[PDB]
Design a protein around this ligand. Sequence first.
Ligand SMILES: *[C@@H]1O[C@H](CO[C@@H]2O[C@@H](C)[C@@H](O)[C@@H](O)[C@@H]2O)[C@@H](O[C@@H]2O[C@H](CO)[C@@H](O[C@@H]3O[C@H](CO)[C@@H](O)[C@H](O)[C@@H]3O)[C@H](O)[C@H]2NC(C)=O)[C@H](O)[C@H]1NC(C)=O
Lengths: 214, 194, 222, 221, 213
Amino acid sequence: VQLVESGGGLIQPGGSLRLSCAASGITVSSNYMSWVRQAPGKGLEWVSVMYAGGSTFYADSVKGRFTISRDDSKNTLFLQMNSLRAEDTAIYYCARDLYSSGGTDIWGQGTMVTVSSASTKGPSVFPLAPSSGGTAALGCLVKDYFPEPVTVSWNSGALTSGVHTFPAVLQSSGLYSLSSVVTVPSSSLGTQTYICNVNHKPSNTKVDKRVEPK
Amino acid sequence: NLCPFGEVFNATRFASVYAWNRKRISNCVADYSVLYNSASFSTFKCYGVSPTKLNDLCFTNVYADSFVIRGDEVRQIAPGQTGKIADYNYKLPDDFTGCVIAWNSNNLDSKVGGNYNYLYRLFRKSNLKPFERDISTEIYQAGSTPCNGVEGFNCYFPLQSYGFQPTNGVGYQPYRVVVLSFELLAPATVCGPK
Amino acid sequence: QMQLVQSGTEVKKPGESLKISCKGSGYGFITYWIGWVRQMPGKGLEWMGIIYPGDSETRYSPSFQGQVTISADKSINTAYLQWSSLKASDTAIYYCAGGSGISTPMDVWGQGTTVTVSSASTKGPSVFPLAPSSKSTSGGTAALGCLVKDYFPEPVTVSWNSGALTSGVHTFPAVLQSSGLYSLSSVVTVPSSSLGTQTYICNVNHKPSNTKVDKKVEPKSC
Amino acid sequence: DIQLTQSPDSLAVSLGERATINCKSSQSVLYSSINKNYLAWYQQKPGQPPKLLIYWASTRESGVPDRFSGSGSGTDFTLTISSLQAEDVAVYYCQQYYSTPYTFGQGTKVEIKRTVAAPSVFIFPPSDEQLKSGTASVVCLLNNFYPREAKVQWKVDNALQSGNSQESVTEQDSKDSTYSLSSTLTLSKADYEKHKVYACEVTHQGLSSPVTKSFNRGECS
Amino acid sequence: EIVLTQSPGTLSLSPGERATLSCRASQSIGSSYLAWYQQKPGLAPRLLIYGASRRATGIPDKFSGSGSGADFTLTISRLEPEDFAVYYCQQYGSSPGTFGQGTKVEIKRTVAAPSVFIFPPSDEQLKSGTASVVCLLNNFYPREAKVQWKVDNALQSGNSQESVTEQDSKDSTYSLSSTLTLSKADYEKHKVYACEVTHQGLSSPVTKSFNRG
Ligand SMILES: *[C@@H]1O[C@H](CO[C@@H]2O[C@@H](C)[C@@H](O)[C@@H](O)[C@@H]2O)[C@@H](O[C@@H]2O[C@H](CO)[C@@H](O[C@@H]3O[C@H](CO)[C@@H](O)[C@H](O)[C@@H]3O)[C@H](O)[C@H]2NC(C)=O)[C@H](O)[C@H]1NC(C)=O
């Protein structure tokens, strides 16, 4: 069983977006299907539900602007969003509901929706070179991008143990910035080559900065 | 030759909404007065007829449907409604002519510990036609793997229980409900006084 | 039988808010939906909306959507009609009316609520005589009167000779002058032979301004 | 949504004769499943709330005398008063309650048809009290006439006045079915002293010719 | 609509202890309509309990739901570092239902001092006119940590931002970055750049510094 969401991205206030949720293992037209959203650091908001027989229901915070619907042949649930406002910015999940006979037991993975006037901007990536107990630290500064998110990996996924990618912070510029670090055996410096792989799908950009001692 | 309204309204036990009762009323004279100035109802909503102006008319049949739902759902017993009850348990038509009478029955239909004798259909693939009764208990198939009458993941018993407890808020308390439908086709055998 | 009683007369400056009420009593009230009807001066009836008090299911007329708020308090059997900000165009009488069911005629009617929205303020009337002369005699009958001018709001009460004189009295309906004040006339026809033997006095009362005037109307000796 | 139109706008019927009023709806109000028209007739006497007379096009409400009757179907309905009585003078409205929003017809005023009665014409110069206050009001009074259509025109030194007079009319009289009318001409005191003849010219069906009532300023009356 | 009020807003307990989470409904709804969820960082929520007490499939015995009327309780016995998450109650008595605002449950831990690292600006970034100096505090507990920038020994205020990771689910520690940002010109104007870290696990404040050159 998997639910997989798509269609989130950046959109201006007053604009429109259509979210999609593909389902395998449950029949969407046979189930109570729901859209639940989560604004950044804010807690779950249940915005919509569609009954197997076609009835639809909305939270008051989106009544009139959002339409939930489905395609029985595609086995796909949809959220049509109009008159988007800044407070609609959130991650959106679809889920399958069972009420007293089970939980909301199946959840998707989430699609991020950002409602802003600001333009899309790919990041600059800068090395955080190590310097000078027997453990070294080094990283990458992913600076000045918009909107969320950036993904960061190290050595194309080879280095996972000891990695910390800090949550992005909005700067006073209105652009996001974050840092990714990894601690290594200090002896490995020079014997091992360390590259960080930065992806910003919202601007179709991708960077491979090698961070080397200095 | 009075109509047997009290048999319906004053029943000791009321039916489950998914298996709602229907009393067919014919060959009688109806005192709607006992209903309309009664003081013991909390909802009394009529559509296309006034209970005052019925004594002049004559009907081929009257139907009195009765069941128990929770207070929050009483608003769904009305034309054009949607929700678990209107879609899967009891559906009024869009052009419904008649009356929906309802009253709180917490004192009779909840037990301490919970009254689980009252059931509703929670799972159904499509909406009831108007005045459809669905008493099926087939295991409901929520995915593509058929259930072979066995419960499990994606295979659900379609009915849920209400579990009425006297401490529930008013919207979660049991309400008894009678729906009066009027039908004329045939000779008119249900008549008001005079 | 059930009956509807509305709240009393309302005089309001433009921009004030207002909430009139309509309370039901008697047997059968559980079945009634309470609508609101507007009648502007000299005009017809206008359906504004309807509410089922048992659960506040409300239906507005498209003209009155957003214009007013219909509400209900089921405990005291009361429906309400309210404005957040009154135009002078809202001057009208509002009836509440009951039908026991949706798609039902309005069986029961309240008595009406008069609502005046004017920028004017309370003002007593000035009372002037309309004296009998040769120009108001039709051989043996003379006509005489009182002009009751520039008052606000309505109503005034006009009687003749402390209320004993009632035959032949015509008190005309008030007309709103461009000033925003009301004006009115009362006339009576009497035997002109009595124009020397009896005195005719008109009594004007304006309760809103707590004014009582008694004017003597005498033959135009000038 | 559903619009209603009534005909006539006003109606005059002799005592004991028949009044007919018509209602036409933009859209049928016959509910086929129960074969009833969702049309009602209300009666509003002056200064009282409306009263339901007939519902479902042709059913009399309780207490409504048999001389009221409703008829018609679909989009055309008729209210009929068979032997018009004094108490029946009122405005009559139709109303559809087939669907919300409910709509009323414009209304039809029903007055007693009397024989023609000519007005008695009287004229009142301003009182000295009012003249000391800055304003002059002349009043013309038309008394106990029928029909209610009457033309009243002010001429000041034979010049025709416009926009400075107001007229007012009584309800139909319960005893004799006539009307009375007052016209009030209000001028400034300055303007009142500038002119001599003040005349009220009255035209009405019952007058073989226009009647004038006149007075000269400050010359008794 | 039914409001759910969760309590407290945060918990903080040692492994092996028992966490007690409360959910209060604005109206007494009854046990059939309530459910509890767990949301770990970067994951969709995971159902724990429905109908107040019925544990879902694959959910171990340590999670226990109880209560009725308007008051419900999630008990997590025998806590592990992996149990760090935000727990939510939900009522589905209405369509749609509503979630409580969440209780974060932190897993307590022996005090662990941070490792402090400082990173001067890269020359690449400098060639573009901006200097970011980064200070890193790695693997510490508890979360509270004062990080002070000092430029030529003057305490710097108003030009730094901090970001802390979510509590590690494996060893219960935190990590923290502080980024001082200057124009390249401002950066030329000064020599000694230091970050001074104050934390319970440190006997005295640790300073890591570098001279521009
Ligand atoms: C159902 O039964 C009730 C009586 O039962 C009582 O009320 C129920 C709602 C339940 O709570 C029961 O457990 C409870 O014992 C019948 O109500 C009775 O109806 C009669 C006739 O309408 C009433 O008599 C009237 O009395 C008034 C003066 O009070 C007179 O003006 C009338 O002319 C008439 O004589 C009687 O008072 C009333 N009693 C109560 C307690 O309400 C109800 O009629 C019946 N329903 C049906 C549909 O048959």
